[PDB]
Design a protein around this ligand. Structure first.
Ligand SMILES: Nc1ncnc2c1ncn2[C@@H]1O[C@H](CSCC[C@H](N)C(=O)O)[C@@H](O)[C@H]1O
Ligand SMILES: Nc1ncnc2c1ncn2[C@@H]1O[C@H](CSCC[C@H](N)C(=O)O)[C@@H](O)[C@H]1O
Ligand SMILES: C[n+]1cnc(N)c2nc[nH]c21
Ligand SMILES: C[n+]1cnc(N)c2nc[nH]c21
Lengths: 291, 291
């Protein structure tokens, strides 16, 4: 067994303290071990992101605009969690595909069937006005050309929507398929528990202060760095069984999940963090139908 | 006579401490009082900007890429000034129109006859590599649509060229002709002595640290502010005769010129700032053929 003892898990990209040459043979390995793992991945990251905003007092009274929301099964759990905590949020889910019907019938959530373009963003900005906007993007066209297009749209989402905070899908193009340098919004590179086995995708979390927008250039050398750090994280780290982690499951991804879940707010009071986390995890797994 | 006593002149937009409702009748008033005033305006601002970079030690060894450089008569004085100071700079002047022939025959200055587009910027970036770039933009298409187009090109100049510093033409569209909000690079809003009588144009001076690019949104309310502050500056301030300014010319624009010129470096040593400024001014006026 691949056992180890860790203090904490890598929560952000910059914390990864080692690298590995990417082995293309890893692409043939099992990418997922849990049913509905994709919904789990998104639910944990978005709970984490939204709990942070609550902590900064910018969540209550906002309209969350989620683009690339369908099917969005896990979004029902999110909505329920904050609704039950008494936070007042309006949800606007926009995607050209259809949403899971469990999202229907809620006055606080509006489902829109439309693929957004710059023009449409403008009309929704005019219509949402003057509410504060929290943007969540999970759009997917992929080729490096596809990604760049996606990233360009995401930056236009921020410039037109002018949100108070954003969570953007972020996966750096592979160095061997570079096309050109580009800019992405400055934010924290949140790592994701339960991401596919060899995924290099993370989540860019930004909070907008003032009327300023800070971007950061991404170069091929950066792409080489993303590749090696994420490959090290995926091949070595995530395959560890944290033995000093006294929890029903000691696999790295659960150890990492624990640290995200400990930051979530609850109504029920618990005697220990461990109790709250186990509660939240059980709750999450039952909702998503994960044994 | 409209006399007053001032400590210093307004050097940047944020220093303007008052405003006035714009009177459209001002547009019918004499816009210029000096021959070649347009060349004078650009020469002073660019001397100011470049002297600052020298002060930060980022000028020597750089290639200055000036887009919208023609005719560019005044650029010859600039080139001569730093060349004679021993600073090593390569100049690349690009414009679809033709440059003043006084710019020909210098190995350190390359004249290009081309209207730049995004694609061309890419090729010049590849060709200038690996030299450090200082960007100067003075492109002119105007309608608010024209301006926006200009500003969008200027931001693409920075993203593709990735300069160490930039000086960009900046005039906010009029509030009564607003189209949409937009972003401009963060920088200092340098005011310009000898600008047309009622011009609201200034120069955006930015220095790029790290791999970050900071932008700032400009809204119609901002446009209203630019209009009133610049109108106050133009109608009231610039029409003052600074009597406590012991100089051959006490008109505000000369008082303002003095403060820009005092920051310029010379070979000759002077006993007082006043002597250096008078020297630089005389030199400048003679070159441009201004009595
Ligand atoms: N311009 C655009 N506007 C809206 N949705 C877009 C888009 N381009 C792609 N998409 C959507 O991006 C989605 C990626 S999969 C999204 C999964 C979803 N976040 C979940 O919680 O289940 C696709 O459904 C696709 O239709
Ligand atoms: N894409 C583009 N590339 C280069 N020059 C451009 C341009 N669009 C407009 N211009 C140029 O912008 C200029 C504005 S007037 C420039 C004056 C010059 N800076 C001086 O020192 O004399 C015009 O000459 C115009 O041809
Ligand atoms: C799927 N995949 C393809 N090509 C790469 N270079 C790569 N690196 C990580 N994952 C990868
Ligand atoms: C030339 N011009 C036209 N319209 C305006 N609104 C304006 N403000 C300053 N100058 C102006």
């Amino acid at each position: 067994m691949d056992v180890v003892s860790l203090d904490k898990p890598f929560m952000y990209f910059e914390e990864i303290d080692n690298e590995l040459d990417y082995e293309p043979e890893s692409a043939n390995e099992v990418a997922k071990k849990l049913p509905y793992q994709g919904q789990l991945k998104l639910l944990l990251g978005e709970l984490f992101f939204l709990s942070k905003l609550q902590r900064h007092g910018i969540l209550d009274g906002a309209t969350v605009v989620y683009i690339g929301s369908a099917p969005g099964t896990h979004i029902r759990y999110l909505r329920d969690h904050f609704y039950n905590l008494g936070v007042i949020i309006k949800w606007m889910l926009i995607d050209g595909r259809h949403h899971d019907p469990i999202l229907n019938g809620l006055r606080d959530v509006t489902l829109v069937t439309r693929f957004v373009d710059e023009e449409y963003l403008r009309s929704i900005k005019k219509q949402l006005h003057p509410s504060k906007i929290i943007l969540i993007s999970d759009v997917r066209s992929p080729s490096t050309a596809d990604l760049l297009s996606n990233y360009a749209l995401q930056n236009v989402m921020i410039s037109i929507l002018n949100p108070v905070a954003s969570s953007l899908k972020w996966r750096c193009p592979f160095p061997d398929q570079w096309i050109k340098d580009f800019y992405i919004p400055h934010g924290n590179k949140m790592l994701q528990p339960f991401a596919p086995s060899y995924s290099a995708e993370m989540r860019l979390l930004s909070i907008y202060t003032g009327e300023n927008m800070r971007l950061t250039r991404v170069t091929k050398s950066d792409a080489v760095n993303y590749e090696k750090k994420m490959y090290y994280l995926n091949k070595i780290v995530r395959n560890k069984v944290v033995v000093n982690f006294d929890y029903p499951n000691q696999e790295y991804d659960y150890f990492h999940m624990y640290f995200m879940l400990r930051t979530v707010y609850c109504n029920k009071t618990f005697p220990t963090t461990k109790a709250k986390v186990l509660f939240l995890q059980q709750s999450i797994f039952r909702f998503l139908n994960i044994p």
